[PDB]
Amino acid sequence: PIPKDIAYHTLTKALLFPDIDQYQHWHHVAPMLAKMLVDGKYSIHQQYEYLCLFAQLVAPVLGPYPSPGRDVYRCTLGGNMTVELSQNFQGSTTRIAFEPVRYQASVGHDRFNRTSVNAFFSQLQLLVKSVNIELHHLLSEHLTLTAKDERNLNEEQLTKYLTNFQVKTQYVVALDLRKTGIVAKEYFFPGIKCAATGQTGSNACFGAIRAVDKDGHLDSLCQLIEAHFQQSKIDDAFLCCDLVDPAHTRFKVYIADPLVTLARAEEHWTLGGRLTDEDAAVGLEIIRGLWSELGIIQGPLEPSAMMEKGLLPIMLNYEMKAGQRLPKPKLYMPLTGIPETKIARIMTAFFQRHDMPEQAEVFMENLQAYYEGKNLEEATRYQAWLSFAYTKEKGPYLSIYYFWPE
Amino acid sequence: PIPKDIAYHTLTKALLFPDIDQYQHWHHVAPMLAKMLVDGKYSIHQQYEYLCLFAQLVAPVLGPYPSPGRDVYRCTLGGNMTVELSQNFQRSGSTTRIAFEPVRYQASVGHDRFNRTSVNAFFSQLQLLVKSVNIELHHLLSEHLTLTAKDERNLNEEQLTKYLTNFQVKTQYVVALDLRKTGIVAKEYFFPGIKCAATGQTGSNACFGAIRAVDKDGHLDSLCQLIEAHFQQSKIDDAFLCCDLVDPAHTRFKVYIADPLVTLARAEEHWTLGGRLTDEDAAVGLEIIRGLWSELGIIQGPLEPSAMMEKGLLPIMLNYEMKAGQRLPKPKLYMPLTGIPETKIARIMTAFFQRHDMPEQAEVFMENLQAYYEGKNLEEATRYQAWLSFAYTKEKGPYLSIYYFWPE
Ligand SMILES: [Cl-]
Ligand SMILES: [Cl-]
Ligand SMILES: [Cl-]
Ligand SMILES: [Cl-]
Ligand SMILES: [Cl-]
Ligand SMILES: [Cl-]
Ligand code: NA
Ligand code: NA
Known part of the structure; x- marks a missing residue:
């Protein structure tokens, strides 16, 4: 009689979504998220908190709902969306990962989707005080397509990037829904920057960590991973960091093989x-x-x-x-x-x-x-x-x- | 030790209010409302539902936060606000009610003199979340109980000058949301005082004339006559009306008097x-x-x-x-x-x-x-x-x- 996603059905009676796209993302995402929060043994208070925060903070940056055949900026999170759910097993903890995107990225008003992550953080920081974006400011230059990089892209690449055909993801935000409070993580995908500069993804990642690691505390760790990437012939890397004060951050270098x-x-x-x-x-x-x-x-x-x-x-x-x-x-x-x-x-x-x-x-x-x-x-x-x-x-x-x- | 108002502290971590006034109304109202919902033995789900609904539907129509000395359209709900909480106590238990006068900032800055539009904006939002809310009575009763264009032409210079500022209380509509465990029931209160200042009619005559105009088959005729006779005999004119915002067939009217x-x-x-x-x-x-x-x-x-x-x-x-x-x-x-x-x-x-x-x-x-x-x-x-x-x-x-x- 009492469904596992009761918190989703309850909030559905109280939340007034301003547009059809936010409405569709809520109905697509919230039922499974509500179930995962019940399964993770989150308190009833925390289930309501996280579902409401998803509605208030995340759904406005998920972009137009990608209905079949709709000509919109594309993402591969959850297979074909701008949002993905994951669960860690230890109770369990849920994570919501998403690429912040606005409709302008689909209609020629934000070619490389640069503004949405900034709009998103300016809202996130108002609700979660512990979120620090100093690393977003420092790392963006090293891992994403700058004005200078864009001037180096060729006619074939620019035409290829003008449409919604190419996946242009450079940023992914993950909200780790810990019981002690949300921790945000930022993923930087240097693929587009590297298509313009000719640099490898791993060289971009290590150069970014070095530029940020002011006292070189991570140099020997970097050298060990770099040498393996050179020896095993891996270039395709991306970076993840915790959005906390740079002193307390943790970097994760990813590779896809x-x-x-x-x-x-x-x-x-x-x-x-x-x-x-x-x-x-x-x-x-x-x-x-x-x-x-x-x-x-x-x-x-x-x-x-x-x-x-x-x-x-x-x-x-x-x-x-x-x-x-x-x-x-x-x-x-x-x-x-x-x-x-x-x-x-x-x-x-x-x-x-x-x-x-x-x-x-x-x-x-x-x-x-x-x-x-x-x-x-x-x-x-x-x-x-x-x-x-x-x-x-x-x-x-x-x-x-x-x-x-x- | 968890605070009684935990649902208020929890939603505070998740709701992003678009302006300072909605933020201040949330912080002013929600802690007491959360406590009352705990006390009325509402399920945890309904506590969150009603607090969120207050934030989403009610706080946007409470108008500028009436800070001391702020020149804004005034209301007397809860003494000096546009919102009032009330609790019902019975053998069966307790229920909470939220009453408010829908108002927008335009009523404070000369863009809605008799605050006519806000109740309409409010209902257009309410009906999207509570499907059982029927406003046919709002459309029918407004003409009989509120200041129309024709009535306004009958206001003298003294009356118009006095109503031009934020000095006079100009309340014509109050909405009450009865937070029943089976679901929200909305009630609408109509205050004919401003209409009567213009027309010269008594409040009770306006109330009974409104009920008669709406009660198509005269089912309430003898009930009305009984109350009207008492009002005539006891010398009471100052009346106001309340109705349930449901299909007119199923509505209940309440005639109020202040003495x-x-x-x-x-x-x-x-x-x-x-x-x-x-x-x-x-x-x-x-x-x-x-x-x-x-x-x-x-x-x-x-x-x-x-x-x-x-x-x-x-x-x-x-x-x-x-x-x-x-x-x-x-x-x-x-x-x-x-x-x-x-x-x-x-x-x-x-x-x-x-x-x-x-x-x-x-x-x-x-x-x-x-x-x-x-x-x-x-x-x-x-x-x-x-x-x-x-x-x-x-x-x-x-x-x-x-x-x-x-x-x-
Ligand atoms: Cl993991
Ligand atoms: Cl910051
Ligand atoms: Cl720091
Ligand atoms: Cl009562
Ligand atoms: Cl209706
Ligand atoms: Cl009816
Ligand atoms: Na599988
Ligand atoms: Na008292």
């Missing part, structure tokens, strides 16, 4: 053997088991051939901490093509084995409620990624990133 | 409609009123409105509810409480609840009142609980309501 094999994931996990710690060694054994049990699909190396069956690359991020001698790895395993019931079976057995019986018991039930009425045996594109990190202290750290149905 | 003569004998005379109300519920109500009036010690103020306002004293009021089937109107008495200490009211309320088989109400009355006015001395305060309304049925027992004024 089209070669989807356990051997390639292992090579990146250990940074070509440079990561010698006990925690990384235990983690790789757990990964070997997970990769095998899940049966991660090896797709084509060509990006256009890869998207034919809707396959994803592997990804990793390396977390940098001033004090530590070694970076901390995180592996993202692509799950598109694997039936949802298979993933649920492997996850349930994993939780049981790693002393998380409360997670194991509800995994399937909760997944089925997010995709109510959908056949989870037939579906292969709902749970898109599984991320894995490990510490002896806290145990396995697993996250699921969801794609919107159909 | 500056604050005596038990005058309240009794109105309660029985000069002896016309002979039912048992009216006789029982009369017994209870006599006791309550005495225990509270309702203050008899001056008959002159300005001399009454000086002492901060209020008149008595009554309403008469009309039902097509019923042979007799149903009375409700409003007893003014300004000038009576809050702890005295609480003591009388607590004892009344205990005798009249309302022990749950009796137990928390004082505690709840103290939390609404946290840190305030309730022995010294005399202007927080402003009115006590009383109605009675054998079936449901005493029906009591407290109408609150904003502190300081």
Whole structure:
């Protein structure tokens, strides 16, 4: 009788959306978000807080609702939207990631979608005082297309970028819905800047960290990762930082790799053997088991051939901490093509084995409620990624990133 | 220890108000409203629903925040605001009501002299969220109870000059949102005072003429005649009307009267409609009123409105509810409480609840009142609980309501 998304149905009776697009994003996103907040054991107060904050802060920057065939600025979050939900398993914590965008980006009034992230932060900082954007100001120059870079783009690239055909994402904001309060993260995608300058994504990322790391506290950590990227031949990197006072920030360098094999994931996990710690060694054994049990699909190396069956690359991020001698790895395993019931079976057995019986018991039930009425045996594109990190202290750290149905 | 107003503190972290006035109305109103919703035993979901609805629908029509000395269109709800909270207490429990005069800044700067547009802007928003709200009666009753273009042409120089500034209270419409657990019911109050200043008609004649114009088959004719005769005999002209904003077939009309003569004998005379109300519920109500009036010690103020306002004293009021089937109107008495200490009211309320088989109400009355006015001395305060309304049925027992004024 009392639905799991009651908080969504309740706020629906009280929120007056100013336009059809915000209305459609609320109805598309809020039911699943409400369920994930119930599942994560957030208090009723915090469920209402986060749903209302989503409505007030996030829905106005999701852009025109991307109805089938609509000529709008495109994004790939959640598969084909400007918003993606993910959940971390430890209770659970939910995360909302989105590319801030306004309609002007679809109608020729913001070619490289530069203004929306700025409009978004100016609203976010009014509600979440702990959000500090000093790093947004410092990093933008190094990781995004500047006026000077744009003057270097050729006729073919400019015509290609003039339409809504190309994905032009440079910024993604993630709101980590912690029970102690929201922490915002900013992702910088140097792809467009690099198309103009000729620099690699990894060179842009390290140059940005160096420009920001004033006392060179991260230099040795950077050198270790750089050397691995040079040796393993990886250029396609992007950066993530916490939007807190620069003193207290954490940088994560991400890489995407089209070669989807356990051997390639292992090579990146250990940074070509440079990561010698006990925690990384235990983690790789757990990964070997997970990769095998899940049966991660090896797709084509060509990006256009890869998207034919809707396959994803592997990804990793390396977390940098001033004090530590070694970076901390995180592996993202692509799950598109694997039936949802298979993933649920492997996850349930994993939780049981790693002393998380409360997670194991509800995994399937909760997944089925997010995709109510959908056949989870037939579906292969709902749970898109599984991320894995490990510490002896806290145990396995697993996250699921969801794609919107159909 | 979680604060009683946790839902207010929670929504404060999530709502981005577009201007300073909406922000100030939220902070002024929402803490007490959140406490009242906890006290009325509303589910946590409904607490969030009603607080958010107040923020989304009500705060945009409360107008500029009336800071001390600010030259803005004035209203007397809650004493000196455009918003008032009230609570109902019964055997079945407690419900909250939010009453407000829809107003926009244009009414303060010469762009809406008699504040005509704001109620229309408000309803166009309300009807999008509460589908059961029907405004057919607003369209029908406005002409009969408010200043029309034709009436305005009949205002003299003195009247027009006096109404041009923000000095005069020009309230013609008040909307009340009754926060029932089964869902919101909206009520509309029409004050014919400005129309009557122009036409020379009495408020009661305007009210009955409005009911007649709307009651197509004359189902309320005999009920109206009974009340009208009492008003003629007892010499009362100052009336206003309330209706439920539902399909006109299902509506309920209440005719209100204000009387500056604050005596038990005058309240009794109105309660029985000069002896016309002979039912048992009216006789029982009369017994209870006599006791309550005495225990509270309702203050008899001056008959002159300005001399009454000086002492901060209020008149008595009554309403008469009309039902097509019923042979007799149903009375409700409003007893003014300004000038009576809050702890005295609480003591009388607590004892009344205990005798009249309302022990749950009796137990928390004082505690709840103290939390609404946290840190305030309730022995010294005399202007927080402003009115006590009383109605009675054998079936449901005493029906009591407290109408609150904003502190300081
Ligand atoms: Cl900042
Ligand atoms: Cl700092
Ligand atoms: Cl994660
Ligand atoms: Cl209507
Ligand atoms: Cl009808
Ligand atoms: Cl009442
Ligand atoms: Na899948
Ligand atoms: Na009082």
